Amino acid sequence: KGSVYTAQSDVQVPENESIKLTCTYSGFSSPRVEWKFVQGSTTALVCYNSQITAPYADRVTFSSSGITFSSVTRKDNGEYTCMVSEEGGQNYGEVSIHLTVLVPPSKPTISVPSSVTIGNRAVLTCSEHDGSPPSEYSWFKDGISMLTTRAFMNSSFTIDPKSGDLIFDPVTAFDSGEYYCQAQNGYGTAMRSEAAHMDAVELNVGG
Ligand SMILES: [Mg+2]
Numbered sequence: 001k002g003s004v005y006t007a008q009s010d011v012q013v014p015e016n017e018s019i020k021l022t023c024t025y026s027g028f029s030s031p032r033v034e035w036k037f038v039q040g041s042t043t044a045l046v047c048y049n050s051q052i053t054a055p056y057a058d059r060v061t062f063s064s065s066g067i068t069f070s071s072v073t074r075k076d077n078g079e080y081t082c083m084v085s086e087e088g089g090q091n092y093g094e095v096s097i098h099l100t101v102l103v104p105p106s107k108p109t110i111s112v113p114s115s116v117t118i119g120n121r122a123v124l125t126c127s128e129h130d131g132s133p134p135s136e137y138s139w140f141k142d143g144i145s146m147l148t149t150r151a152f153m154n155s156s157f158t159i160d161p162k163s164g165d166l167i168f169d170p171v172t173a174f175d176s177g178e179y180y181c182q183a184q185n186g187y188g189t190a191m192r193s194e195a196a197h198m199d200a201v202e203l204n205v206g207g
Helices: none
Strands: 003-005 010-014 019-022 024-026 031-039 042-048 060-063 066-069 078-086 092-102 109-111 115-117 122-127 136-141 157-159 166-168 177-184 196-201
Touching: 003 092, 010 019, 019 092, 042 060, 109 177, 122 136, 122 177, 136 157
Parallel strands: 010 092, 115 196
Antiparallel strands: 003 024, 019 066, 031 042, 031 078, 060 066, 078 092, 109 122, 122 166, 136 177, 157 166, 177 196
């Protein structure tokens, strides 16, 4: 019959740069090429009847071998599906391409409670929302990297690299110290946050 394929189904490209989403096909004579963009629940047509649609006409150019973006932004992340059909609908084929627009992580912020009551729970947060793909996190206490393997077994802590949560349950006097974190996503350079000190006392905090 007729096949439809792509050179790269997982495309990564820095923000603001040009990129061509390729879609090759063979076995067609009078093909109708269409493209759709899926992000979450939103479904938009980029190309209809071999023609770039209105909302994309200002930066997307059509060609029989794929669509070229003169520039992409983080808002373009998602999957693009190239749909090729022989005029009449007898022969059909399609191929999906996931686009990831690269953006290095921004300086993350941290939430470290100045005072916590020993025996209770304490969650220190670390995050940034600009990185693409999403950043992973790591923590430090008084300059020591908490995981390299734990920096010390003397604490009942847990760290979730994906959310960035540093969890102390229960918190002990030993957990008192200066903490800061860093975010990285394999692109650009890792960024560190500001440091913050946490004091662990014996009685209830907050009066
Ligand atoms: Mg913002």
